[PDB]
Amino acid sequence: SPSLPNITL
Amino acid sequence: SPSLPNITL
Amino acid sequence: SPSLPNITL
Amino acid sequence: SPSLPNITL
Amino acid sequence: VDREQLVQKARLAEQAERYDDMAAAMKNVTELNEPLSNEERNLLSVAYKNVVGARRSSWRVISSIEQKTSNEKIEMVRAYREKIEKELEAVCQDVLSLLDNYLIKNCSETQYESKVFYLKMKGDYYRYLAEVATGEKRATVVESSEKAYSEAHEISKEHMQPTHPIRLGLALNYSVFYYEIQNAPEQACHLAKTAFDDAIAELDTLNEDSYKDSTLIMQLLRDNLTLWT
Amino acid sequence: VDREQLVQKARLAEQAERYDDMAAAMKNVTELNEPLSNEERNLLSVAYKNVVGARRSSWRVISSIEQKTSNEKIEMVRAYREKIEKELEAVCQDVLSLLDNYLIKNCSETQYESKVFYLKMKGDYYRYLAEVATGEKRATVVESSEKAYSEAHEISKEHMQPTHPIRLGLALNYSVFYYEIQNAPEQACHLAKTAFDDAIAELDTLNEDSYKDSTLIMQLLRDNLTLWT
Amino acid sequence: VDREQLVQKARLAEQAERYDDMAAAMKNVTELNEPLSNEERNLLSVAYKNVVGARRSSWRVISSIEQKTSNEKIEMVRAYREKIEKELEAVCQDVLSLLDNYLIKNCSETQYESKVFYLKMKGDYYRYLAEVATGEKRATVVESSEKAYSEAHEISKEHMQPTHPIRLGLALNYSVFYYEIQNAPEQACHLAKTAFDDAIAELDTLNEDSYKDSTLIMQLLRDNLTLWT
Amino acid sequence: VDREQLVQKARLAEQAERYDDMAAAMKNVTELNEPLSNEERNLLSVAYKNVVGARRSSWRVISSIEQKTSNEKIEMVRAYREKIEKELEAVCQDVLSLLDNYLIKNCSETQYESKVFYLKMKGDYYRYLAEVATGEKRATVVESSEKAYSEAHEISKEHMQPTHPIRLGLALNYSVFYYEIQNAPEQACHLAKTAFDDAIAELDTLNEDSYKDSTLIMQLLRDNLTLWT
Ligand SMILES: [Mg+2]
Ligand SMILES: [Mg+2]
Ligand SMILES: [Mg+2]
Ligand SMILES: [Mg+2]
Numbered sequence: 001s002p003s004l005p006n007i008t009l
Numbered sequence: 010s011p012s013l014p015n016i017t018l
Numbered sequence: 019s020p021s022l023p024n025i026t027l
Numbered sequence: 028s029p030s031l032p033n034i035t036l
Numbered sequence: 037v038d039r040e041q042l043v044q045k046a047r048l049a050e051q052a053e054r055y056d057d058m059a060a061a062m063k064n065v066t067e068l069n070e071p072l073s074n075e076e077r078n079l080l081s082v083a084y085k086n087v088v089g090a091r092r093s094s095w096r097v098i099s100s101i102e103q104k105t106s107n108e109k110i111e112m113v114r115a116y117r118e119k120i121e122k123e124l125e126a127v128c129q130d131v132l133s134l135l136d137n138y139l140i141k142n143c144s145e146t147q148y149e150s151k152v153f154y155l156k157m158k159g160d161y162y163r164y165l166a167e168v169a170t171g172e173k174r175a176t177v178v179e180s181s182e183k184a185y186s187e188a189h190e191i192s193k194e195h196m197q198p199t200h201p202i203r204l205g206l207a208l209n210y211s212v213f214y215y216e217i218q219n220a221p222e223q224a225c226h227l228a229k230t231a232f233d234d235a236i237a238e239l240d241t242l243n244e245d246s247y248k249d250s251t252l253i254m255q256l257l258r259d260n261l262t263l264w265t
Numbered sequence: 266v267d268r269e270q271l272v273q274k275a276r277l278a279e280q281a282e283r284y285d286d287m288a289a290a291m292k293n294v295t296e297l298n299e300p301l302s303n304e305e306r307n308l309l310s311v312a313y314k315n316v317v318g319a320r321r322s323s324w325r326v327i328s329s330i331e332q333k334t335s336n337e338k339i340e341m342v343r344a345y346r347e348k349i350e351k352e353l354e355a356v357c358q359d360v361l362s363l364l365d366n367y368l369i370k371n372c373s374e375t376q377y378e379s380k381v382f383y384l385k386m387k388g389d390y391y392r393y394l395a396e397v398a399t400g401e402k403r404a405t406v407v408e409s410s411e412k413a414y415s416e417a418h419e420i421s422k423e424h425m426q427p428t429h430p431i432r433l434g435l436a437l438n439y440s441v442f443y444y445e446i447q448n449a450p451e452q453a454c455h456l457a458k459t460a461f462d463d464a465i466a467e468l469d470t471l472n473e474d475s476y477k478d479s480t481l482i483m484q485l486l487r488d489n490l491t492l493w494t
Numbered sequence: 495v496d497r498e499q500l501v502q503k504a505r506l507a508e509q510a511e512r513y514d515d516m517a518a519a520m521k522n523v524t525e526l527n528e529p530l531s532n533e534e535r536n537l538l539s540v541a542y543k544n545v546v547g548a549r550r551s552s553w554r555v556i557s558s559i560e561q562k563t564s565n566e567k568i569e570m571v572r573a574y575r576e577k578i579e580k581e582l583e584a585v586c587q588d589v590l591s592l593l594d595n596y597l598i599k600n601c602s603e604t605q606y607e608s609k610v611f612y613l614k615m616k617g618d619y620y621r622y623l624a625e626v627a628t629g630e631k632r633a634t635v636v637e638s639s640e641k642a643y644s645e646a647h648e649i650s651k652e653h654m655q656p657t658h659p660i661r662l663g664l665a666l667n668y669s670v671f672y673y674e675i676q677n678a679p680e681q682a683c684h685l686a687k688t689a690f691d692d693a694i695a696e697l698d699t700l701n702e703d704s705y706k707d708s709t710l711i712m713q714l715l716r717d718n719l720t721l722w723t
Numbered sequence: 724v725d726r727e728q729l730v731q732k733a734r735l736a737e738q739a740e741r742y743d744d745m746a747a748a749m750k751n752v753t754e755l756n757e758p759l760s761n762e763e764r765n766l767l768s769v770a771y772k773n774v775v776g777a778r779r780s781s782w783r784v785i786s787s788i789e790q791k792t793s794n795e796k797i798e799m800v801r802a803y804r805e806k807i808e809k810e811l812e813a814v815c816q817d818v819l820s821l822l823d824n825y826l827i828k829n830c831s832e833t834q835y836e837s838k839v840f841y842l843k844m845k846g847d848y849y850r851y852l853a854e855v856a857t858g859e860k861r862a863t864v865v866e867s868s869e870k871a872y873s874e875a876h877e878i879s880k881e882h883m884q885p886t887h888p889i890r891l892g893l894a895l896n897y898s899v900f901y902y903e904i905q906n907a908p909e910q911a912c913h914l915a916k917t918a919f920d921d922a923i924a925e926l927d928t929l930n931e932d933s934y935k936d937s938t939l940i941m942q943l944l945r946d947n948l949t950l951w952t
Contacts (some may be wrong), residue, residue: 002718003618003670004663004711006543007536009508011260012160013076013205013253015085016078018169020489021389021441022434022482024314025307027279029947030847030899031892031940033772034765036737044570051559052552094510101509112502115460120510128574239476247468251480273799280788281781281807323739330738341731349739697934698927705926709938 039068042082046079055086066134071142077153078149084131088164092125095168121168128161135161148195149202155188158204159213166217178217185210197241201249208256215264225264232257268297275308284315295363300371306382313360317393320353324397350397357390364390377424378431384417385435388442393445407446414439426470427463429476436460437485445494454493461486497526504537513544526591529600535611543587546622549582553626579626586619593619606653607660613646614664617671624675638674643668655699656692660706665689666714673722683722690715726755733766742773753821758829771818775851778811782855808855815848822848822889835882836889842875843893846900853904865904872897884928885921888936894918895943902951912951919944 037045044060049058062080066072072080098117105113139154143241162181169177189210192203207227235241235254242250266274271290278287291309295301301309327346334342357398368383392409398406421432436456444453464470464483471479500519507516520538524530530538556575563571576608597612619620620639627635647668650661665685673682693712700708724732729748736745747765759767772864782946783806792800822870826841849868856864876897879890902911922941929937 001668002713002721003667004672006547007540009505009536009540010212011215011263012209013256015089016082018047018078018082019441020444021438022317022485023494025311027276027307027311028899029902029950030896031943033776034769036734036765036769041570044567045574048556048559048571048574052555052574053548054552054578090511094512097510098506109502112499113506116503116506116510120512236473239471239473242468242471244465244468248484251476255477263451265521270799271889273796274803277785277788277800281784281803282777283781283807319740323741326739327735330735338731341728342735345732345735345739349741694931697931699930700926700929702923702926705938706942709934713935 037064039065043076043079046083049127050079050082055083055090057084059087063130063134066138069138069142071144071147072139072148077150080134081153081157084127084161088124088127088131088161091120091127092164092167095120095124101121107243124168125165128165131161132158148191152188152192152196152206153202155184155191156202156209159185159188159206160209163209163213163217181217182215185213193233198231198238199241199247199250201246201253203248204231204235204253204257208260211257211260215260221264225261228261228264230259232261266293268294272305272308275312278306279311284312284319288312288316292359292363293430295367298367298371300373300376300379301368306379309363310382310386313356313390315424317353317356317360317390320356321393321396324349324353353397354394357394360390361387377420378429381417381421381425381435382431384413384420385431388414388417388435389438392438392442392446410442410446414442427460427467428470428472428476428479428483430475430482433460433464433479433482433486437482437489440486440489444489450493454490457490457493459485461490495522497523501534501537504541508537508540513541513548517541517545521592524596527596527600527601529596529605529608535608539593539611539615542585542619546582546585546589546619549578549585550622550625553578553582582626583623586623590616594673606649607658609652610646610650610664611660613642613649614660614667617643617646617664618667621667621671621675639671639675643671656689656696657699657701657705657708657712658702659711662689662693662708662711662715666711666718669715669718673718677720683719686715686719686722690719700721724751726752730763730766731771733770733883737766737769737847740758742777746774750817753825756825756829758831758837759826760836761931764837767821768840768844768875771814771848775811775814775818775848778807778814779851779854782807782811787860812852813860815852817931818848819845835878836887839875839879839883839893842871842878843889846875846893847896850896850900850904868900870905872900885918885925886928886930886934886937886941888933888940891918891922891937891940895940895947898944898947908951915944915948915951918936919948 042065046058046061047063049055049061058079062083063075065076066080095117098120099115102113102117135154140151140158143150143154159181162177162184165177166174166181175214185206188206192200192206196203198204208231211224211228211231213224214220214227225239232254235250271294275287276288277293278284278290287308291305291312294305295309322347327342327349331339331342331346363389364383369380369387372379372383388410391406391413394406395403395410414435417435421429421435425432427433437460440453440457440460441454443449443456461483464479500523504516504519504523507513507519513723516537520534520541523534524538553575556571556578560568560571560575593612598609598616601608601612617639620635620642623635624632625641641666646664650658650664654661656662666689669682669686669689671682672678672685690712693708729752733745733748733752736748745766749763749770753764753767782804785807789797789804791799797806798906822841822845827838827845830837830841846868849864849871852859852864854870872893875893879887879893883890885891895918898911898915898918900911901907901914919941922937
């Protein structure tokens with residue numbers, strides 16, 4: 001959302 | 010693909 | 019705008 | 028192109 | 037549940053992108069063992085197209101990793117491909133048995149549009165099985181796909197206008213079947229071109245409730261012809 | 266240059282996004298003082314729409330800075346707006362004099378489509394002048410825009426099918442004229458709705474060479490109606 | 495399976511967008527009852543974020559239909575929302591028990607980065623439970639979310655650089671927690687602003703292996719501050 | 724006008740996408756015959772990059788039509804290409820004479836950043852001339868481009884940090900010069916790789932006012948290296 005983007009693997 | 014687009018509901 | 023799109027040549 | 032992006036003002 | 041509630045659940049599941057739920061509600065509706073209304077028909081098809089599609093997508097990805105990867109990992113990749121494959125086959129069989137044991141079976145004589153819509157679905161889901169099948173299994177599902185499309189084609193030629201969206205969408209997928217499954221690019225272009233020409237010849241057969249759908253699929257036929265030629 | 270060469274220059278200028286060049290070539294073609302062929306008509310309109318458009322864009326931007334900004338900078342902003350305005354007015358007058366002194370003037374009696382196409386352009390370019398005009402100047406250009414659209418409307422009703430793309434595009438811009446210039450949202454919706462209804466009523470009047478254009482503009486009418494209602 | 499094979503299955507499941515499979519493989523890896531390597535840690539988090547996310551998406555959609563819809567349909571909508579809710583709660587509890595019973599529990603003393611990464615996850619998944627909880631249940635999960643974020647914050651302040659991506663991502667989500675869950679927009683901006691300022695003050699603490707991640711999250715903090723102020 | 728007013732006109736022209744106006748205002752500012760402030764420097768460069776760019780775009784389009792087209796039309800295409808070419812050359816010469824007769828000429832000794840910024844521009848605009856030149860004319864402008872980039876490179880190595888955005892952007896364009904103009908892909912990769920490595924080696928040299936620009940151009944260097952290798 002306004003939260004951290006999910007990790008790029 | 011080159012096939013029919015899924016129906017719009 | 020809400021007006022006619024410019025002609026495609 | 029592969030060159031530097033134009034400055035953002 | 038009542039029927040109205042299953043259908044309402046399908047509509048909510050759709051909006052929530054929960055397609056397994058949507059398909060399970062529409063299968064349940066089908067299993068009430070009565071005909072489907074146009075909307076029910078469309079919900080069923082949307083649901084299962086989404087379920088089979090993701091995997092139709094996952095299989096392509098893992099197959100591609102397999103081809104690039106093949107060190108021996110290879111066992112895993114292969115196992116996972118086969119797992120996805122079995123899921124995809126079970127989805128197709130799930131739809132095909134609804135079609136064979138209910139929808140086609142019990143379709144009333146004068147419901148030509150339903151008939152063609154279900155025979156086209158039968159062609160489509162055998163074609164999805166053909167995408168993954170090999171050997172004698174491939175030969176069988178390919179034959180079954182073409183038989184279903186051919187019967188749909190004969191009924192639609194006799195009973196529907198050339199502009200009817202269901203007739204046009206049939207020609208689209210039937211020609212994709214020739215192009216991609218049978219690698220018969222002339223037979224594909226001829227079918228697509230004929231369907232397009234016959235609709236164009238009869239614009240006066242466009243319906244005020246469906247003309248946007250008709251013209252959209254006409255363009256899709258054209259797009260494929262252009263690509264293929 | 267010969268005429269073929271001016272038209273070839275317009276086509277190249279278009280592809281190069283050099284619209285001042287494109288407009289100057291098409292003005293030169295018009296000044297040969299013969300009628301324009303459909304393609305010449307379209308090149309002229311494309312060229313000038315692009316020229317007037319950028320500025321129709323620049324003026325909105327500087328006007329907006331003006332409103333937000335208005336410290337006394339203000340002199341500059343205002344001066345620059347007025348410079349862009351004068352350019353935009355001169356472009357419109359450039360087109361309007363081609364229309365009045367050549368294209369409308371000399372259009373042959375049986376060329377109804379050309380007549381309506383040029384009267385619509387005349388409505389359009391007076392409407393662009395109205396977008397920036399104030400006071401008595403606004404009143405004058407607004408009157409001239411509506412007079413041009415009204416005459417185009419009468420000819421198109423008599424001589425063209427309700428599905429004809431030029432008739433449909435006229436209704437689109439004429440209704441935008443009512444909505445945006447005269448702030449007459451009922452008169453706008455009625456015109457758009459009538460044009461859409463009359464085309465729908467007669468799909469059998471779609472032409473095999475233009476049906477995509479017809480249906481596209483039908484959708485544009487619908488989009489505006491939806492927005493406005 | 496061996497551990498390498500579960501992790502390979504997670505990587506394949508990811509590429510195939512089969513996140514239920516990815517999460518089940520990474521849970522299995524966790525249940526081998528040894529610490530996770532950085533990559534295993536990231537795969538676990540990616541898997542569960544995707545699983546909880548879709549539903550974090552489905553719930554918002556059905557909740558919105560519920561609010562617009564609420565004729566008595568309403569029973570269905572409500573039932574379906576509650577079904578999705580229970581799934582979402584079970585996913586969160588699935589992660590929270592991995593965290594409490596394995597990952598946090600057994601994390602070795604000198605593994606500060608792991609500690610903070612898992613305490614942040616614990617804050618995140620209690621915050622997802624808070625998004626849907628009401629009444630005394632909400633109060634409890636909100637308290638647990640803040641306790642987890644606060645402990646992560648204390649460890650990261652002591653043991654990590656202000657530019658460390660894990661410290662920066664913690665500040666990002668902790669401040670979102672204040673803004674969205676506790677509706678404490680000053681406490682949110684202060685935390686985000688402090689985390690950003692402290693990193694800026696120490697660019698010399700950027701690592702050659704992680705500086706892109708650091709600067710990316712710095713920008714995310716800035717974006718939120720701008721939105722909120 | 725005063726200087727403040729020319730600069731305000733450039734800022735308005737920019738927002739209005741009127742780049743000919745923007746360039747003419749900034750040329751006028753330069754012709755006041757005093758040094759430029761960082762902002763003036765950036766406005767000048769933005770203005771002329773946009774002016775030369777469109778045409779740098781139009782020329783590629785007409786050149787491509789020329790190659791596909793080459794029936795004898797060919798005369799026109801060729802003439803139009805040459806017209807665009809002459810415009811593009813005159814723009815470059817317009818900038819190069821500002822650089823040679825004012826900006827470089829009068830740059831004070833301790834203004835290393837300005838020096839490098841203007842020498843890089845001199846390299847850039849000779850490189851744009853080289854893109855279109857042939858024969859002995861090409862040889863001359865290529866030599867002049869490399870001489871300008873080489874001098875900029877020597878000053879920047881001595882006086883700026885490896886992370887400085889102006890130093891990084893120089894390496895980017897200098898390496899593009901080797902790749903595209905001299906078709907020296909090893910000399911291009913070495914320069915880009917060296918510039919990237921030297922910045923990475925010294926992140927502690929990032930400035931709190933410019934680190935976003937530094938990291939952005941680092942990524943651009945990386946993107947090119949990846950493409951080229
Ligand atoms: Mg017939
Ligand atoms: Mg009529
Ligand atoms: Mg510290
Ligand atoms: Mg140094």
